[PDB]
Amino acid sequence: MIVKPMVRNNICLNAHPQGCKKGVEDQIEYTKKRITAEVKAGAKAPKNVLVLGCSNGYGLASRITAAFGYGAATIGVSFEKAGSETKYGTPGWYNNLAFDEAAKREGLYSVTIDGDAFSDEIKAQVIEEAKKKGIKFDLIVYSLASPVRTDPDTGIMHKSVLKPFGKTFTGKTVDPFTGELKEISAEPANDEEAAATVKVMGGEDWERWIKQLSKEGLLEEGCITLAYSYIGPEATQALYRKGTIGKAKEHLEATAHRLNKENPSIRAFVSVNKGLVTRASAVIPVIPLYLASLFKVMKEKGNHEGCIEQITRLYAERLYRKDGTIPVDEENRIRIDDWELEEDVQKAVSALMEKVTGENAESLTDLAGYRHDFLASNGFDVEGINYEAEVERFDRI
Template sequence: MSEHVIAPKSRGFLFLDSHPEGCRQLVDEMWQAVPAPVAAGGEGPVALVIGSSAGYGLAATIAGLARVGIRGIGVCFEKAPARRTGTAGWYRTAATARLARQYGRDMVFLNGDAFSDTMKEQVADLLAERFGGRLDYLIYSVAAPRRTDPDTGRLHTSVLKPIGSPHTTKTLVFDEYGAPEVKEITAAPAEGDDIEQTVAVMGGTDWERWITFLADRSLLADGFTTAALSYIGSPLTAALYRQGTIGAAKSHLEATARRLDERLGTMLGGRAVTSVNAAAVTQSSTAVPGIALYVGLLRGILGDAMVAPIGQLVELWDQLTGARPLDLDDEGRIRLDTWELDPAVQHAVAERWSTATSDTITELADLDWFGDEVRRLYGFRVPGVDYTAAVETDVPWPAPTS
């Protein structure tokens, strides 16, 4: 047993510890936010969620379990409790597994490098031995700083840079006392093989490798469907995101989807799509300069009309399973971001962005909400949690039930 009172300590938007009870209650909240399950006879479909412990991947896992009744496998990469607490994803996974068991869902969680062929072998063996040797759905939601190519052993590192020329943008930071500051930063442009490296990590290469690996083992069911989660975002953040190195990776992901869609359609009557999700506060998004400011302003305009990741992923599962019609844009992408990119909303955000300064930001953006959302990523500021009480930090990784 290892009980501690855990106080939030951070470096910018990165917190050094996570709160197990807060993470558990956050997962409970997300599960309870899912509408009643879609009626289905017999066992639920078999699904694989790659990147199941955080952000949209976590939402995909919980929405799939609670809405569709999926069974299957979640893959993520989290750190166990040691000198510090476990990562928030470690505790969220334990909480998700507990709810899955409670509601009779057979969900196994594997902790390791999703880019490796070792993990692919482990998943393939589990699908064959435990889940009847047939996979119905694969959700790909991986945001990683680096990837080792299994064929060459080369380590690729992604970068967040504009392409062509330096780019200056506004960004939101908080000083040591928690006061908000709006600053300008200038990002140097990509050079050398920065674009190639970022595409190798964040593009569609590993997604396609998963599909090929499982297809070669004859593990894809007839009608198999796969979706990779993506983001386009606002023109305000485009130079550093969608038009930058990350955007090049997203374009590669979408090109991969088109290639996989043709292949799966011919082979299995299946399909592959990208799902363009909308803005949210996630551990990945807070690392992008300008995104914190943009999301805070967006919330200041829309309030509760913003659709949380769990709501977006319910919509995605409904479309993938046929509960609602598949709604694709001209590029063959599912668009869950139309409320964010509505021209009137973007015009309002742009107006606030242009006048945002350290003196005006509290009037223009919902910073209380933003601060709470950042802390909730690590299990803090969750209603109903007593943060003065000691809590057990040595939570074990969920063992698969028999």
């Protein structure tokens, strides 16, 4: 069985087990070189970390940075599909396996809980695991990437949508594989859609995790909790500020404020991260063209970051600094999109988006970098992996 990427409806349908593994190992290796003795010396360190959404992207990087950077014990939660002998698991399933294996090889405590993180069943499972080991958490990272949430008190399922308000949102977009430029649109959402999105992307579950953990006395004094979010460029403020996403963000930010007021011994932040290729990226106008242009501009400037570069910087230069402060903006958010939103960067990116055409997209923007990030998420196009070799089982890594 030769496994090559199968992409349809802008989604990569399969995954490569050894590729996903090499991907995790590469992040671990970077972490070991980035988070050195000097970087840690004189700063505090996380000891027991809970990561909700630990199998991909920022969540996975957060777990790797905690464990292999700072030597912390970690419990990760994610909802994956296991693989069988002949059927693909989700990429996150192979990522978790690779993580737990490396953690064990290093003698680090690591436990992965697979299930719906929005459910009280899973929360109860973390709680009992913590009480057994005698763990109290000092860092809780909320990085849940789901388009749907089944409300645990009412059982009804909500799905988020990505739409503006009042006026339809139209803009250029690009296919990184073909090079095709198009114009697509997002029509204004209704109340049902807006309310569903808030339900999925807001801070309801974040708060629920904190309260249940609090009641069971599983939060260490001074415990940091973070939720990842995105603000983005001016070109997409219609969705990220005044769209359905913007409303969910406002809810998440209000949730963070309330967590700080109700738990005096806690430090809760929304962490605003940089833009990267996500599963949803292809359905949003402007975004795929923005990212390709951002990648080009930042790689040329020399400050391009992927997930693990972002999060290691988050730990070393926001959470665990030697001056003991946690720098925030005027609204008390941690900002690591500071490089992305630099004036010179955004100006050049905008110029690039204005100039892009059909024949020049490949050379003007970084579609190649975009393709790589898209594929690497599922374990494809990873350096050092043969890909012409057959995979015996989809049961191991």
